[PDB]
Design an enzyme around this catalytic site. Structure first.
Site, PDB file in Angstrom:
ATOM      1  CG  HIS A 278      -2.592  -5.848   4.984  1.00  0.00           C
ATOM      2  ND1 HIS A 278      -2.381  -7.039   4.322  1.00  0.00           N
ATOM      3  CD2 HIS A 278      -3.777  -5.373   4.529  1.00  0.00           C
ATOM      4  CE1 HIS A 278      -3.403  -7.285   3.520  1.00  0.00           C
ATOM      5  NE2 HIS A 278      -4.266  -6.291   3.628  1.00  0.00           N
TER       6      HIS A 278
ATOM      7  N   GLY B  97     -10.705  -6.084  -0.857  1.00  0.00           N
ATOM      8  CA  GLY B  97     -11.571  -6.659   0.176  1.00  0.00           C
ATOM      9  C   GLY B  97     -11.466  -8.165   0.323  1.00  0.00           C
TER      10      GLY B  97
ATOM     11  CB  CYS C 146      -6.796  -9.189   2.270  1.00  0.00           C
ATOM     12  SG  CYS C 146      -5.778  -8.620   0.936  1.00  0.00           S
TER      13      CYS C 146
END
Ligand SMILES: *[C@H](O)[C@H](C[C@@H]1CCNC1=O)NC(=O)[C@H](CC(=C)C)NC(=O)[C@@H](NC(=O)OCc1ccccc1)C(C)C
Ligand SMILES: *[C@H](O)[C@H](C[C@@H]1CCNC1=O)NC(=O)[C@H](CC(=C)C)NC(=O)[C@@H](NC(=O)OCc1ccccc1)C(C)C
Lengths: 306, 306
Positions: free
Chosen positions: B41, B143, B145
């Site tokens: 993503h 942040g 991920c």
């Protein structure tokens, strides 16, 4: 969101850990520049523990008695000296993995990460706090001595603890990196007593703010209290006194959540007087006191390091 | 002695963490050999989250759109491909810090260490378990991920988790390192539901054995139970069924403490039916289920790594 008991990344410390063997004692050392730091009781055999004279034992030692071993590579000891309860072994090689570091002594109530090691190899990392009675509730088995505790601030490692011993209640005692014990303990295996502990009030309040930040609000109220009236309750439940300095330190968390510090004190009073009534706070059924206000802010704003 | 929620030393993983920026999304990647792994993503802007077509977005991207950054050094992306929900960015430099590693998928009930990172820099390390409902109770801010979960077995890192998203109850969901989600979650920001969770029975029993090893014995008894009668109680308290395999896995802890597994089941039954009556077990007022039998044995025998 979420809230975990979170340690600092341990890589910078892993590169400093070595094995120190002398006689039949094996333990861990900390290799910074061309010095290896380790507990001085390495110079002791099993009959020595009961009443040792470390200056006696150390003048009888020589450099080649100390087997220092960094992973596989052998470190040649070229000198030795004692500093309080730590031994400083000078080796002929500077650790190329030496981080920016400082030797700091922490206060009761402060937290740090422990890198538990055996035979110079890291086993695990966890967080804990220096208790008001100068012990720590660690996880240490025999061979763990010389494991260190630390904090990290950007790229700098502040070493604050070196492990030496376990007390009869299963709690742990050790020194700062200058070899000075935390608390009234000595590195002899004579009967020693941890001393009555207390709960770290400012940390409990910090953790209640962590809970509000994370959506646990059931313990909030609009009762308020004065600092003096709160401290009367603290003393009854074996909590330490809350100072105006503690109130100031909680300012940012109070500002973030919109809950005045003295209002959160009134919540803690009710929790102390009534219990939690089968409910939990951040997944705990006890009031947690091993998170400092900094730990909460750090974890709920995402500060990093390298 | 002592018992802590203990993570693996994180150094081996710290050396793999990089920053991946594309468009206005910044997140973490995992740099192994000449590939950087990250959540797909990243190719999404804020308007994309609500109903994305990742194959659509990816053919419109080019190599130079991906800003990969290892500490300070810039990594040139020379190819990209999608694998399930992860992106594989081929770079022109192999990570010289690549450890021995494996990509493993774990089972609900198993534990792992999480290295929480922001902007490619490690922030903290903690332990958790994969819940029966395939979520994890992590600590993740925006942040984070691309942060990974892992276990270590001597020198080999078994990566098992990459972080992708937070669900409305504040729990977390992610993939294995082949990009396949744990549980019925998708990397879209449409309404998604964690699913009812249960308590990991075998882990609770393991932790009770940890407590006995550490000197907490007040919950022991000589009531015993059959496996069938225990599982009737488990179901009532939303515990998962205990299998004969679980009993076998607890064998070594049973042997060490001299407490038969079914006897410890009878203790857990009484704890479930009566509560703890103001007492604690290993410093908890709840029955803890995020320690596996291996975690207990590891911590109470001192296994190391490097
Ligand atoms: C170093 O690896 C070990 C670590 C220790 C082993 C088990 N858990 C631990 O943390 N440290 C020691 O073996 C030290 C040696 C020392 C210099 C004192 N010894 C202990 O930790 C003993 N503790 C002790 O003697 O405390 C005082 C005391 C209290 C009551 C009766 C007698 C002595 C411990 C192994 C019994
Ligand atoms: C990556 O850094 C973040 C990490 C996330 C931010 C806060 N805590 C975290 O763990 N991940 C995201 O921003 C993802 C993006 C994605 C591909 C889905 N988005 C989320 O985590 C949102 N969660 C979400 O949309 O879940 C489904 C849902 C449920 C209910 C209503 C709407 C959507 C989250 C930030 C709201």
């Amino acid at each position: 969101s979420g809230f975990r008991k979170m340690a600092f990344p341990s890589g910078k410390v892993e590169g400093c850990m070595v094995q120190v063997t002398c006689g039949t004692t094996t333990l861990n050392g900390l290799w910074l520049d061309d010095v290896v730091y380790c507990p001085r009781h390495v110079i002791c055999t099993s009959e020595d523990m009961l009443n040792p004279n470390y200056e006696d034992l150390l003048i009888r030692k020589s450099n080649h008695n100390f087997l220092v071993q960094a992973g596989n590579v052998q470190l040649r000891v070229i000198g030795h000296s004692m500093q309080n309860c730590v031994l400083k072994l000078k080796v002929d090689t500077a650790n190329p993995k030496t981080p920016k570091y400082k030797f700091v002594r922490i206060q009761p109530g402060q937290t740090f990460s422990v890198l538990a090691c055996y035979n110079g190899s890291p086993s695990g990392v966890y967080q804990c706090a220096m208790r008001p009675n100068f012990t720590i509730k660690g996880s240490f088995l025999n061979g763990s001595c010389g494991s260190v505790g630390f904090n990290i601030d950007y790229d700098c490692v502040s070493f604050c603890y070196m492990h030496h011993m376990e007390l009869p209640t299963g709690v742990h005692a050790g020194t700062d990196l200058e070899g000075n014990f935390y608390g009234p303990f000595v590195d002899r295996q004579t009967a020693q007593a941890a001393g009555t502990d207390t709960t770290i009030t400012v940390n409990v309040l910090a953790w209640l703010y962590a809970a509000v930040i994370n959506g646990d609000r059931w313990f909030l109220n609009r009762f308020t209290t004065t600092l003096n009236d709160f401290n009367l309750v603290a003393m009854k439940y074996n909590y330490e006194p809350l100072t105006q300095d503690h109130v100031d330190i909680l300012g940012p968390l109070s500002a973030q959540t919109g809950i005045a510090v003295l209002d959160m004190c009134a919540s803690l009073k009710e929790l102390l007087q009534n219990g939690m009534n089968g409910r939990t706070i951040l997944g705990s059924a006890l009031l947690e006191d091993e998170f400092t206000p900094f730990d909460v802010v750090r974890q709920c704003s995402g500060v990093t390091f390298q």
